[PDB]
Design a protein around this nucleic acid. Sequence first.
RNA 1: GCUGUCGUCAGCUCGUGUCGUGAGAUGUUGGGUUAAGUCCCGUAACGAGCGCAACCCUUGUCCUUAGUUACCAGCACCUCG
Length: 224
Amino acid sequence: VNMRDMLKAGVHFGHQTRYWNPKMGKFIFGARNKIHIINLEKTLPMFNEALTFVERLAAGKNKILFVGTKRSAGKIVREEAARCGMPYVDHRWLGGMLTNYKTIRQSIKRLRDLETQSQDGTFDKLTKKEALMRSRDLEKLERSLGGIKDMGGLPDALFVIDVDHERIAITEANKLGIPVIGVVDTNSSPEGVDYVIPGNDDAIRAVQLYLNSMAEAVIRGKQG
RNA sequence: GCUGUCGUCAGCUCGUGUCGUGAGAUGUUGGGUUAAGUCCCGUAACGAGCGCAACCCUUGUCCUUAGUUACCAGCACCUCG
Ligand SMILES: [Mg+2]
Ligand SMILES: [Mg+2]
Ligand SMILES: [Mg+2]
Ligand SMILES: [Mg+2]
Ligand SMILES: [Mg+2]
Ligand SMILES: [Mg+2]
Ligand SMILES: [Mg+2]
Ligand SMILES: [Mg+2]
Ligand SMILES: [Mg+2]
Ligand SMILES: [Mg+2]
């Protein structure tokens, strides 16, 4: 989008040069000041390809699950994935939400029953110890499976903000065989993702920019 | 069928998922804490069962119900029980 803007935010920044992956040497503009710099002139065409792919796919009542768990990075995803549907996760990705979805459905149902009991008019009208225990279990279940309450089926697409941090999710998606959108970094691994985006991590501006791009992308692609 | 013992020690397993060509392994490992696989947070695991704890009996405080063959604060009789 208009070049300079992400050239201001954080995008042309790589994870040093001691810790790097040669598999994406073709995406590197050239290391300067002991830091690898991503080739900004090449990312944007593929970024727009991902934009149009997700916009076209969203038309048809399609849900794309977002993953953004990280140090102070899940909080922005919490509301960026909010609205326009788009189920998400915001905490530690518990392995098995895709291959073992049958087990996860029981946890979803239990959480729904617990929250319905909690909000029915405060059914927990008994000793404060029992009510507090139920409340903390309920909030733990929320922190784990808040964004999965909807989407009883399996998602047909998936978006990642740091492909190295959640390699479990990419492995699960490959095993199930669903497309993956990924923001990759110079120390990450390009394979597994079907629409790779060579950006930057650890930059709040960068993650927010990608999230807004895709949020209004799915907004304008879901007009029908 | 019934019983001892390890031992009233905190352990013993399963479903789905995942890793390994396999026997198998993860869950059940880590840092704390507890009498306890008790609990917290982390964590390719997510859940469940038999165990631990709880529900049972007795004792230790108090309230109500009730005063016979039980008791005697107060009144009286008293042959002073
Ligand atoms: Mg195998
Ligand atoms: Mg071994
Ligand atoms: Mg073993
Ligand atoms: Mg072993
Ligand atoms: Mg086994
Ligand atoms: Mg097993
Ligand atoms: Mg064991
Ligand atoms: Mg084992
Ligand atoms: Mg237990
Ligand atoms: Mg017991």
